[PDB]
Design a protein around this ligand. Structure first.
Ligand SMILES: Nc1ncnc2c1ncn2[C@@H]1O[C@H](COP(=O)(O)OP(=O)(O)OP(=O)(O)O)[C@@H](O)[C@H]1O
Ligand SMILES: Nc1ncnc2c1ncn2[C@@H]1O[C@H](COP(=O)(O)OP(=O)(O)OP(=O)(O)O)[C@@H](O)[C@H]1O
Ligand SMILES: COCCCCCNC(=O)CCNC(=O)[C@H](O)C(C)(C)C
Ligand SMILES: COCCCCCNC(=O)CCNC(=O)[C@H](O)C(C)(C)C
Ligand SMILES: [Mg+2]
Ligand SMILES: [Mg+2]
Lengths: 266, 264
């Protein structure tokens, strides 16, 4: 058994390989001690680590472990997954929407980090909590899928009214910009959470399309566990990527790109 | 008297020229009062721009020229920069209004190179949801000495005792420390500082990205979102500098569009 681990800020992704049978396992980073205990009882032929919490694992386990930089690991694993799933992309932006968001240009050969932003899954959870008091991820995301953003977000057409706007009227002009115009109207937990997801999605996508233009690629691959149990986030991102003339791709087990990559790096 | 008006989503900026230049701000909610004021005046030249220009034009009883806000903003900003002793060959300008519009000025003309809904509208709206404060001066004042430490997650918090691949002091996740501090008091000042933080960081990130793309080191920040918000100015300024770019603020930068409308 070969094991790759991407121990990130919020989730630990574990890939176990045995004779080309893969196991994909998610654990909370808060439960890292259990991952360590588990590892110490396993028969491991090779162990590769990546992510911010790789060191916490390495220092507490009884076996050697190779450690890799998460950006290279993510790129390597993502390339593997893309090819397995029948995407032959000459080049692409990849946006890793984790606790935070890291943006990369893959030129066909190697990755380069071309940007990043603190709008990601961490913000969804944290700001989500401040606005709703919900700490449970599944509960938080499920609720948001039922939300309406109309009373919260301001569109271009709301600013331009009955005049022709210089960019499309349906675009978000200001996230949370309708709130002060709806002070009688209600800001239900679902509606508020949908708007949080909305801003995070729009920001990530905006950054991704911008660097896509900069590096002259139309392909944008979105990965990260922030897309799990969040159809709304996937939709916000997908729709706006398409609107901007780019091609969005999601990847089966994309959140495990780093963990897979760690196993296959030299 | 010549008059230029930039009637935006939140504020109406009025520039009056007689000889002497005068600057006046009114709330877009009070657009009816601007209209009343205009209808009394003998105006030799009246120019309008911004989203609510049409509401003004359709309720006034005189003619008016209407200009596109992007060109107007560029024109007026160029004028202000020269008046204030800047000779910039080229630059990004970021207009942080209700929403945020990004432009590359090549020395000759502007091109819109991006935009984002993180701006002054979000500061007010999300600020309200987290603090129940509707008064702008109260909201921004309350944010000024907030502490973001219990709210925001840094790169070094994720990487712990290992060397991170990007600087450890960088924000990794806005609001990403909240779940690690559930026993803590999320005070209104702390929450609002975090709101300003995310807006500032997003705007700056976009500006520095297009600055790299279009090969300019100069980033000029305008918009009324910088009024009564030293913290926003600081978040933006510090991160722009960190990213190897030169940030500029402009006296009356928020009136760039209103001035520009007069001179187009
Ligand atoms: N079971 C879960 N528990 C908590 N968050 C989850 C869960 N499933 C999905 N998420 C979402 O995924 C995000 C984490 O994504 P991911 O695992 O890609 O990041 P990470 O690798 O831990 O973070 P980073 O790469 O920034 O260190 C969370 O912030 C949350 O939005
Ligand atoms: N007195 C005030 N009242 C309300 N908001 C204010 C005030 N002073 C500054 N602001 C801030 O300025 C922002 C509006 O900035 P600005 O005047 O540049 O936008 P706008 O032109 O009205 O909007 P847009 O160009 O996106 O249509 C507000 O969202 C708020 O953050
Ligand atoms: C002082 O901070 C200014 C704000 C800078 C914002 C830019 N932040 C980033 O690029 C980091 C975003 N987060 C990430 O890339 C990931 O979460 C890692 C895990 C930190 C790589
Ligand atoms: C459907 O949502 C699409 C995502 C929108 C993201 C981009 N939005 C924008 O660029 C508009 C931002 N706002 C602005 O430029 C200004 O506020 C104006 C006044 C609308 C020009
Ligand atoms: Mg990660
Ligand atoms: Mg404006």
């Amino acid at each position: 058994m070969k094991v790759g681990i991407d121990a990130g800020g919020t989730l630990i992704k574990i890939v176990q390989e045995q004779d080309n049978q893969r196991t994909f396992k998610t654990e909370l980073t808060k439960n890292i001690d259990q991952v360590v205990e588990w590892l110490n009882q396993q028969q491991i032929e090779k162990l590769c680590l990546t992510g911010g919490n790789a060191g916490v694992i390495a220092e507490n386990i009884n076996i050697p472990a190779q450690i890799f930089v998460e950006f290279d690991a993510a790129s390597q694993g993502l390339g593997i997954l893309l090819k397995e799933q029948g995407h032959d992309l000459a080049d692409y932006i990849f946006a890793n929407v984790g606790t935070g968001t890291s943006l990369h240009y893959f030129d066909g050969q190697s990755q380069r980090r071309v940007g990043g932003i603190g709008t990601g899954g961490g913000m969804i959870q944290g700001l989500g909590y401040l606005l709703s008091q919900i700490t449970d991820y599944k509960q938080l995301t499920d609720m948001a899928q039922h939300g309406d953003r109309n009373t919260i977000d301001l569109k271009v057409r709301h600013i331009y009214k009955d005049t022709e706007p210089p960019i499309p009227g349906d675009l978000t002009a200001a996230n949370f910009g309708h709130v002060l115009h709806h002070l009688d109207a209600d800001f239900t937990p679902s509606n508020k959470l949908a708007a949080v997801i909305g801003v995070v999605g729009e920001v990530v996508t905006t950054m991704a399309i911008t660097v896509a233009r900069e590096f002259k690629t139309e392909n944008i691959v979105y990965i990260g566990s922030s897309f799990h149990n969040n159809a709304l986030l996937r939709k916000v991102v997908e729709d706006y990527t398409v609107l901007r003339g780019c091609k969005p791709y999601y990847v089966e087990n994309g959140a495990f790109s780093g963990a897979i990559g760690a196993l296959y790096l030299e």
